[PDB]
Design goal:
The structure is cut from a larger assembly and holds chains A and B.
Chain A: E1 11-14, E2 26-30, E3 33-36, H1 38-58, E4 62-65, H2 72-80, E5 86-87, H3 99-115, H4 126-143, E6 155-158, H5 165-173, E7 178-180, E8 193-194, H6 202-219
Parallel strand pairs in A: 4-5, 4-6, 6-7, 7-8
Antiparallel strand pairs in A: 1-3, 2-3
Helix pairs in contact in A: 1-6, 2-6, 3-4
Chain B: H1 5-18, E1 23-27, H2 30-41, E2 47-53, E3 56-62, E4 83-85, E5 94-95, E6 109-114, E7 117-120, H3 121-127, E8 131-137
Antiparallel strand pairs in B: 1-3, 2-3, 4-8, 5-8, 6-7, 6-8
Classes of the chains: A alpha/beta, B alpha+beta.
The structure holds 2 RNA strands.
GO molecular function, one term (chain A): structural constituent of ribosome
GO biological process, one term (chain A): translation
Coiled coil (chain A): 98-143
RNA sequence: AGCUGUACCGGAAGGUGCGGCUGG
RNA sequence: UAGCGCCGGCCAACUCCGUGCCAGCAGCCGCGGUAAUACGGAGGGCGCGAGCGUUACCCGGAUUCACUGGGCGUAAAGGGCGUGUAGGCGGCCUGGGGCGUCCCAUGUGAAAGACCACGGCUCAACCGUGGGGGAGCGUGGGAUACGCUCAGGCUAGACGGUGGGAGAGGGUGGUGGAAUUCCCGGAGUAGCGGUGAAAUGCGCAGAUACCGGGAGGAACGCCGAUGGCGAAGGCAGCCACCUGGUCCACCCGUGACGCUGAGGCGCGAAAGCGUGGGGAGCAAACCGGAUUACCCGGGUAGUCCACGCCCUAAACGAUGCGCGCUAGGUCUCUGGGUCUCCUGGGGGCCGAAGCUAACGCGUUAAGCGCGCCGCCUGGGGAGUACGGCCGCAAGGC
């Protein structure tokens, strides 16, 4: 508490949206909103940070997922302030189950980036250059940050488990531990290490991600 | 109308376990208490407790589940996989000592209402008695 | 667009009257 | 002495010649109409072997009558719906009886056969000796958890009491207006009507369009809804009377009085029938006009009322009735409260777990269970034949 309280962490969704399986993390209902218990948040936060800190010392990597409009910037900033990869534009179907195929796209990106750093581009008439540049920029848009993954990650960090349900399903399929910042409308079962908080309110995302990243930093 | 209390209790337990509820409530009686006791020792349910709901005596059953599983469908494994009713109103099943069934090659239990109380198949075979075949659990 | 209970059919490759159904 | 059946798949075992939708094979699927591993022959091969095949019959496979061990929303299968007799089944606590139930002992359960162990025929088949098993009954003794019975209690099922609520629930009387048709009176003249476009038809005996009065029959616009009520069928103007069902609150009374239900008894759209009325509009059959039906103009039954029959359906949510348990979200009709909300009862959509061949169902289950009833057993012939019951008949079961 005393940091989570003023961050709007405890501010859940309305009664129209809540998942009954999440009722164990609910404290009370006020003014048509669900209030998330904060002591349970503290306990779960402690547990998840213990896991994260152990993983950080061990040497594994964490993939920072999250593509909500108000979460993209925070995800990118917190991820870049570490060696950790991230996805914040769009989750392509099969970034994990179809890792080899996406790695080919990564290689294409690196080769094109090398080519535009070369003076050998003066062939291939200007419009061919145009299409090549379009391909390159699309690749940078969708695969920047994902470039750091040389292999399968050791854990995944999902901003909204409901939003990035595809990523959660993939990670479940491949026995990859899932850490998620859930809210009232999420499924507590699918998350290995849950932080019952807020998925909206920039402030909450900022606080949680900042703390996690700092812990990773000092753990290394 | 409620025609069979014991089948009702078994169904209550099954329905509770299929949705991983930690506890269930059933209307209380001596016979149900005996069934719950036999289940309790064998370590199927966590344990039963006598309570009162609006003055009406109830039995509250605390259920047991395996550890949380890994990968897709992370729901924990069941301790009571299968539970049935053998002898039903309109068809009573009575077995002698010789005819006492063996369940899952000894992995599962069968509950008998013998003249010497409510027992398991093992206890009945030791005591050399038979009787009404209530249910089988595994 | 068909189907169906019932009742007729001396221009039945089927039609019409009174109701019902969507299995359009 | 060595034969017999097979060689497309099932099903172990493949090439050539002959024929060419022929001759023929076949247990099923099926081969043969020109290069047939399926027909006939040959060579090889496979399986049994003094035997090898075929036909007939029985069990299996067949969980394909499902006690072990099936099903009914759409594949065959929920009765058209109530009321209810026999039957089946039935809450909580305590005591008696030991009927079912369980156990011990004992008498039977002939021999032969079956099982086991030894033996005798040189082995085996066959046979001998010994031992045990055995469902089911009789007698004696024991136990009382469950079912039964008999007593004594309890209120969680069921039913009453008091207060209130909504409703096209049903029957009987009685009146309100709009509209169509017809008759009378007035005013006015050449078309009106109808179609995809036209015709038949009506009109100079004055039609259509207009105004006023009168007669009669049937149905009730707006509200009216994805609404409400009933067991189903089904039920809409309004008023009154008589009357059924149901919901809620209080938690006051009885103290298991309950659920289902083969027969029986009652209700049962429409279309039909009989005996009497009635008949405005519409309209089978029928009569005419255009263009094979369709469409247009007429028109009998019928549609309406009373009484008595008929008893069918896509009579449907294609889902029998009762009770209990299993996440929720949203819309709506109707009660109660401490009225942002909470708690009952109906009607709808989307969806947890689960179920399903799939579609889809999902607290209004087609989920998980218990009780009772009905029904299914491949298609066609066939709801046909005969028989029986019912009906005036059509026809129904």
């Amino acid at each position: 508490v005393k940091e989570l309280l003023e961050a709007g962490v405890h501010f859940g969704h309305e009664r129209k949206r809540w998942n009954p399986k999440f009722a164990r993390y609910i404290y009370a209902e006020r003014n048509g909103i669900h209030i998330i218990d904060l002591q349970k948040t503290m306990e779960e936060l402690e547990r998840t940070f213990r896991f994260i800190e152990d993983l950080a010392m061990r040497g594994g990597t964490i993939l920072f997922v999250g593509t909500k409009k108000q979460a993209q910037d925070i995800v990118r900033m917190e991820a870049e302030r570490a060696g950790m990869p991230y996805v914040n534009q769009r989750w392509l179907g099969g970034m994990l189950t179809n890792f080899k195929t996406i790695s080919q796209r990564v290689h294409r990106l690196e080769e094109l980036e090398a080519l535009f750093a070369s003076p050998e581009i003066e062939e291939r008439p200007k419009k061919e250059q145009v299409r090549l540049k379009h391909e390159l920029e699309r690749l940078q848009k969708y695969l920047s940050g994902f470039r750091l993954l040389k292999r399968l990650p050791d854990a995944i960090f999902v901003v909204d488990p409901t939003k990035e349900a595809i990523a959660v399903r993939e990670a479940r399929k491949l026995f990859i531990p899932v850490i998620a910042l859930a809210d009232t409308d999420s499924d507590p079962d699918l998350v290995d290490y849950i932080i019952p908080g807020n998925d909206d309110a920039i402030r909450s995302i900022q606080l949680i991600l900042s703390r996690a990243v700092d812990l990773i930093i000092q753990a290394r | 109308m409620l025609t069979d209390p014991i089948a009702d209790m078994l169904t209550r337990i099954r329905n509770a376990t299929r949705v991983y509820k930690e506890s269930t409530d059933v209307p209380a009686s001596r016979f149900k208490e005996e069934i719950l006791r036999i289940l309790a020792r064998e370590g199927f349910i966590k344990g039963y407790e006598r309570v009162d709901v609006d003055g009406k005596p109830y039995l509250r059953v605390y259920l047991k589940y395996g550890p949380r599983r890994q990968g897709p469908d992370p729901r924990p494994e069941q301790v009571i996989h299968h539970i049935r009713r053998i002898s039903k109103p309109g068809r009573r099943v009575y077995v002698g000592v010789k005819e006492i069934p063996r369940v899952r090659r000894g992995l599962g239990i069968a509950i008998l209402s013998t003249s010497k109380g409510v027992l398991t198949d093992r206890e009945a075979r030791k005591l050399g008695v038979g009787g009404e075949l209530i249910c089988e659990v595994w």
